[PDB]
């Protein structure tokens, strides 16, 4: 127990990728094996982690430690696993992996670039691991310049303005949470102040709470696209490449909301239970103006882009709503849109760089030719519009439940915000099918030549597939990934003081 | 000691961006031996056109021997003021020194009553004939104690900011 | 109301700077008298 | 300008002793004299009555001066490093001190369009060294 | 009859030696006095050793000083020209200019800034400015057939000729409403003495010091001569001054307004303020639109830089000056990494603007990279130095109540992340057809890559050790 674990499962990766540097073997070829085998390690060594090293039945931290580091401020190698944390680091190790093997052809640099995945997949480890707050910060900041680099080397016709005002808008939203940093941590430096820990006893004066709460929502808001915060997402992927996209529109956004339900509902209650209902009219629009504008766009990227935006919406209204089931069924709902959104990315970037048409109207018939990736791509398309058996329809449905068996409602907008929020269902096959009649349906040209246009091989069919098991498995049976006995007392300093 | 007319409490806030609360003095206001000084007093720690003790700090805390605040304007002593005009002349010298606690306007000067008071944490028979009495605490003796043992630059001031977070009149 | 208003505005405040830098670059630039002017003007506005 | 504010006690003395030429009065000495170099007092100086004009406490670090070369009041230097008849202060001592009117600025203000001093004034001083 | 001097009595004796050699010996001397006068520095380093954990002992009839504070940046400074003249070497020797008195023109103005170190004088600390300024119109200007090296004489001379003098009148004003007094510590006496210290007066004295001291570290309203000369002299020069004469003016400046101004805290804390919050703006703005690399790292390295440095000058009751100590150690090292790159890269080609630095990571990918880590340093990210620095530039800053500067300050180096970022993207390409005929013949491949490699570690390392250099730096009372 204490040899370290956390500490290996985050010094693994960019360690062991410093050695693609100084390594003069080849072009392209062995650095894959190279990678792969890293980070298929990587994820052996979590998964043991888990299973034999963890109980599911104590609300404690597990596996942690620490030591010093810079001490004048006090800041340590503080480090630890838990329930809230547990899904998205297992959930980061599975993603990232398979994403680095769907960048399986890039032979553009091929060393810089899995050097640069292995970065950006210890640094959400570091964020997802963390237990102390500068720490959590560091770690939120680490995978700002790797991101920059996927999307400024590789991605898109017009790369360069979106990867500067990803960098830029992500960077200058970061500023209010180091201003709460700053806050938080000069309150009474002597009580240990940085230990993320030892912060559930903080009794905070009035009109600090506010200013800090405001401090982290508003970098929240950057990372995790709330509606007027929104602007940058559609440039950031419309842009990318399919293999940097996958991990960024299915991690790196829901670190977002798991940071949101670390440090606000568990630190800052009287702070978030008098701000909880704003929260939940947001998210309740943005699940229709998302669709809304989705409906509008013209290239198929984008409104994949503003698909993933909505489904933002439940996860905002599910840590509002202050019930077990609704901060528990936002967890299930960031690991079921990690899954979806990620594949639909891969989907649209494998279908295109095949037929280098972007445009939704000019897509012809593309049915005829290969059939495998149709079939896959109306499975995930299903899936996306929560349709039940699949694994999007089960974390809406707990959702909906955390939302009506609210205490902090009173049976008037717990009704209407369940209206407005079930429009979502009328809007969201509007703008889905739509692009899946215009690109697939019809016959196009006589497009006979088995020319760029081949079905999916083994590589991306067998990504297709294992990523879409885990969908079915858990909306058959979602009790493994309600594994989750922290809410019972996350939810529990909430839960009786005015109002 | 004599009798007791009102009672004003006042809260005790350290930390060099903001104050934590540490605790809550209680002291009470003769009334009755020296009305206009005791008036004067709490009327600041009330209210009454914002001239008040809300947000002010001890910005001389002599270890053993006193703490003195009540500069609401520069935080350095030479501020402060009160409500008949700016300053006003002693009143009595009826109640004297006793032991640890009493209140007293520090003056500039006799007949130069201001905003500043001070606690005296320890006995002070020699200070008597020339300052005024108006106050002793009755609950928070260690909290004083504890401002009184704060760390102290060359100044005399204290390396982490006292403020005074809210005060009030709290009657019997 | 998308594009036009909030892309407006968060382009705007990132437009607004490259059209103010070269717009505050191209005043004096150059003639030692007029930087001289321009220091002697900020010590005399200073004195206040 | 004139006279400000301030706030402080005194820590009431003894009797003080004249000496012939100045008011002298000790209330602790601790340690060790000063020769002639730079030395670092605190002060605290009032009006002949009840007045308080400066005080080294209304300012960050206590003012350092010269002990032993002419640079200061010609009472000060002779009740500070010590003068005819009267034992020099320790480097942790503290004294308190009236200056007649000749040991002092003399029969003339120090104006800056309204003198900072009455013209022919005699102040007091409670020194600690430091 | 003293060893305080010693340690410049040795560098002294480093310049007799320069001047001989020339005078006596022919033409042995070239790659000879390169290595002599590193021998003077490293033995003057080596003599400043010494006096680690001293007393604050006054100086000769108490004239510079003497004690702990003051000697760490008189250490920096020799650090400073330990790094500098390797590269302000090779530069001039591939003009056919001659070396020996560029040499000693270096070692005679890294003198006067280590002298300024010191000066609790009120005339040595007139006299080592313009042992420093003298020595600066020379070398700025220290390549005669160009031609911008001339405008970069002219306005140089004129303006630090205005600025000495509104300095010296501002101390002429001092010593006369002060009784008579030169000695720095002893003002507060004899400003008393003389009871004309709260009149007007001194409220004169103080604007017209601290607008000269503003010109010798260029904040924004006086910035104005900073970018022409930056551009018009010679890189080494630019890197040389944009690093010592920031150090030596920031500790003169910490001196001459905490000794004698214990009063007036409340009119100067304001007013540095207000040049701070210009610094760092008009520091940047114009940093984006430049295209020219001298100029924008005069702008950005410069113009901004020397903002959150004040950022605690102001915000100081000696809990941050241990900040001040720590981010000038980042700094020296993330300048001089970026400086001894450009150097290397425009010798090798024989270029400055920006838009040539495409694809030079394909031709020569370790110096593509030795540039990209101290720019990014100057940016401030997580990992690296610079963002260890701001952050415990800010941590005490914030920790002293002012809030309306830490917030402009991580605003502006958000601002300031686009140009870093802009000029690393054109060095990552590979579009052939774009890259102009300059990095296409680069023959890629001693004494600048050592220095270059030994100098962008240090912009990485300490930000993660700063521990050792915290627990050094708070042991300083000046």
């Known amino acids: 127990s204490y040899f370290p674990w956390l500490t290996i499962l985050v010094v693994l990766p960019i360690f062991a990728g410093s050695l693609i540097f100084f390594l003069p073997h080849k072009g392209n070829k062995i650095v894959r094996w190279y990678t792969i085998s890293i980070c298929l390690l990587e994820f052996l060594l979590m998964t043991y982690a888990f299973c034999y090293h963890f109980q599911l039945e104590d609300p404690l931290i597990q596996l942690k430690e620490d030591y010093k580091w810079i001490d004048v401020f006090d800041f340590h190698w503080r480090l630890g696993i838990d329930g809230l944390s547990l899904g998205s680091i297992l959930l980061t190790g599975f993603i990232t992996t398979l994403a680095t093997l769907a960048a399986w052809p890039i032979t553009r640099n091929s060393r810089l670039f899995y050097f640069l995945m292995l970065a950006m997949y210890s640094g959400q480890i570091g964020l997802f691991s963390s237990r102390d707050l500068l720490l959590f910060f560091i770690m939120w900041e680490l995978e ?356 | 000691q004599s009798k007791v007319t009102n009672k004003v409490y006042f809260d005790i806030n350290i930390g060099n961006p903001v104050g934590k609360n540490v605790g809550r003095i209680v002291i009470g206001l003769y009334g009755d031996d020296v009305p206009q000084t005791v008036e004067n007093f709490r009327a600041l720690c009330t209210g009454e056109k914002g001239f008040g003790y809300k947000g002010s700090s001890f910005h001389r805390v002599i270890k053993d021997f006193m703490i003195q605040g009540g500069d609401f304007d520069k935080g350095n002593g030479t501020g402060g003021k009160s409500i008949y005009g700016r300053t006003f002349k002693d009143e009595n010298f009826q109640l004297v020194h006793t032991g640890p606690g009493v209140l007293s306007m520090a003056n500039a000067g006799p007949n130069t009553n201001g905003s500043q008071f001070f606690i005296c944490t320890v006995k002070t028979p020699w200070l008597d004939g020339r300052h005024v009495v108006f106050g002793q605490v009755l609950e928070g003796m260690d909290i004083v104690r504890m401002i009184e043992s704060s760390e102290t630059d060359r100044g005399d001031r204290p390396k982490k900011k006292v403020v005074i977070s809210e005060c009030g009149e709290l009657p019997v | 109301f998308d594009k036009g208003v909030i892309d407006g505005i968060t382009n705007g405040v990132g437009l607004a700077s490259f059209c103010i830098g070269e717009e505050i670059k191209y005043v004096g630039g150059g003639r030692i008298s007029s930087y001289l002017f321009f220091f002697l003007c900020y010590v005399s506005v200073f004195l206040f | 300008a004139r006279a400000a504010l301030e706030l402080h006690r005194s820590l009431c003395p003894l009797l003080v002793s004249p000496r012939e030429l100045e008011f002298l009065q000790v209330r602790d000495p601790s340690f060790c004299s000063v020769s002639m170099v730079v030395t670092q007092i605190h002060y605290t100086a009032r009006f002949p009555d009840g007045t308080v004009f400066d005080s080294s406490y209304k300012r960050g670090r206590p003012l350092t001066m010269r002990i032993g070369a002419g640079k200061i009041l010609r009472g000060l230097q002779q009740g500070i490093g010590g003068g005819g008849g009267v034992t020099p202060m320790l480097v942790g001592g503290k004294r308190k001190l009236m200056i007649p009117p000749i040991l002092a600025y003399g029969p003339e203000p120090a104006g800056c369009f309204s003198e900072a001093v009455f013209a022919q004034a005699e102040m007091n001083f409670c020194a600690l060294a430091a | 009859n003293g060893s305080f001097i010693f340690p410049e009595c040795i560098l002294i004796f480093g310049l007799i030696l320069l001047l001989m050699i020339d005078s006596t010996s022919d033409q042995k001397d070239r790659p000879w006095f390169y290595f002599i006068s590193s021998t003077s520095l490293v033995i003057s380093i080596t003599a400043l050793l010494f006096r680690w954990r001293e007393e604050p002992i006054i100086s000769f009839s108490g004239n510079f000083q003497t004690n702990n504070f003051n000697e760490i940046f008189q250490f920096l400074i020799l650090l400073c020209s330990t790094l500098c003249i390797p590269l302000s070497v090779e530069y001039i020797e591939c003009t056919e200019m001659a070396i020996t008195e560029f040499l000693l023109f270096v070692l005679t103005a890294t003198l006067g800034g280590m002298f300024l170190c010191g000066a609790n004088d009120l005339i040595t600390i007139f006299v080592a400015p313009e042992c420093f300024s003298l020595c600066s119109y020379l070398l700025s200007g220290y390549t005669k057939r160009d031609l911008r090296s001339n405008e970069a004489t002219m306005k140089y001379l004129l303006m630090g000729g205005a600025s000495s003098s509104i300095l010296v009148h501002g101390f002429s004003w001092l010593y006369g409403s002060s009784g008579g007094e030169i000695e720095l510590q002893e003002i507060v006496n004899g400003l008393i003495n003389t009871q004309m210290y709260n009149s007007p007066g001194i409220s004169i004295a103080l604007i017209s010091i601290t607008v000269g001291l503003g010109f010798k570290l260029s904040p924004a309203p006086f910035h104005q001569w900073t970018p022409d000369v930056y551009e018009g002299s010679p890189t080494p020069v630019v890197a040389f001054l944009s690093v010592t004469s920031k150090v030596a003016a920031s500790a003169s400046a910490t001196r001459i307004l905490d000794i004698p101004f214990y009063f007036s805290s409340n009119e100067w804390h304001l007013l540095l303020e207000i040049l701070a919050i210009l610094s760092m703006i008009l520091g940047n703005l114009l940093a984006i639109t430049q295209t020219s690399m001298k100029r924008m790292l005069a702008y950005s390295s410069i113009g901004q830089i020397g903002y959150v440095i004040i950022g605690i000058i102001v915000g100081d009751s000696n809990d941050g000056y241990a900040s001040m100590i720590t981010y000038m150690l980042f700094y020296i090292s993330m300048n001089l990494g970026t400086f001894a790159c450009i150097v290397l890269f425009g010798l090798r080609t024989g270029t400055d603007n920006i838009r040539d630095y495409a694809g030079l990571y394909m031709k020569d990918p370790f110096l593509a990279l030795s540039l990209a880590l101290c720019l990014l340093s100057l940016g401030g990210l997580p990992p690296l130095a610079g963002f260890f620095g701001k952050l415990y530039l800010f941590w005490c800053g914030w920790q002293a109540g002012l809030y309306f500067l830490v917030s402009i300050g991580l605003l502006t180096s958000v601002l300031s992340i686009y140009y870093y970022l802009k000029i690393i993207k054109l060095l990552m390409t590979g579009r052939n057809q774009e890259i102009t005929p300059y990095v296409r013949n680069y023959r890629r491949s001693n004494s600048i890559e050592l220095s270059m490699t030994v100098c962008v570690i240090a912009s990485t390392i300490p930000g993660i050790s700063m521990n050792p250099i915290l627990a050094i730096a708070q042991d300083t009372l000046f």
């Open chain 1, 144 to 499: 700002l310049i790797p991101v920059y680099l996927l999307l400024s080397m590789w991605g898109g016709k017009r790369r360069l303005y979106s990867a500067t005002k990803f960098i830029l808008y992500t960077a200058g939203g970061s500023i209010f949470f180091l201003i709460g940093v700053l806050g938080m941590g000069l309150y009474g430096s002597n009580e240990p102040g940085l230990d993320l820990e030892r912060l559930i006893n903080q009794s905070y004066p009035a009109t600090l709470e506010i200013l800090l709460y405001f401090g982290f929502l508003i970098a929240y808001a950057v990372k995790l696209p709330i509606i007027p915060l929104h602007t940058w997402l559609p440039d950031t992927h419309g842009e990318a490449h399919y293999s940097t996209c996958m991990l960024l529109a299915g991690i790196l956004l829901k670190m977002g909301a798991y940071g949101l339900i670390r440090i606000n509902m568990e630190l800052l209650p009287h702070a978030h239970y008098l701000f909880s209902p704003w929260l939940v009219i947001i998210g309740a629009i943005q699940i229709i103006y998302a669709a809304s504008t989705s409906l509008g766009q013209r290239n198929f990227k984008k409104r994949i882009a503003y698909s993933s935006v909505s489904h933002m919406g439940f996860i905002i209204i599910g840590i509002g709503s202050i019930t077990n089931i609704g901060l528990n069924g936002a967890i299930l709902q960031i690991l079921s849109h990690g899954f979806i959104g990620a594949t639909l990315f891969f989907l649209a970037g494998t279908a295109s760089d095949r037929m280098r048409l972007v445009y939704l109207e000019e897509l012809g018939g593309i049915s005829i030719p290969m059939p495998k990736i149709f079939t896959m791509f109306s499975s995930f398309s299903m899936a996306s519009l929560a349709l039940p058996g699949m694994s999007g329809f089960v974390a809406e449905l707990v959702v909906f439940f955390g939302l009506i068996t609210s205490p902090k409602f009173l049976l008037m907008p717990k009704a209407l915000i369940t209206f407005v929020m079930a429009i979502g269902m009328i809007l969201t096959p509007i703008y889905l099918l739509s692009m899946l009649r215009q690109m697939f349906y019809g016959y196009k040209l006589f497009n006979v030549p088995n020319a760029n246009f081949v079905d999916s091989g083994p590589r991306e069919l067998f990504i297709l597939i294992c990523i879409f098991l885990p969908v079915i498995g858990i909306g058959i049976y979602p009790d493994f990934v309600l594994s989750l006995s922290v809410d019972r007392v996350e939810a529990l300093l909430s839960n009786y003081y005015p109002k």
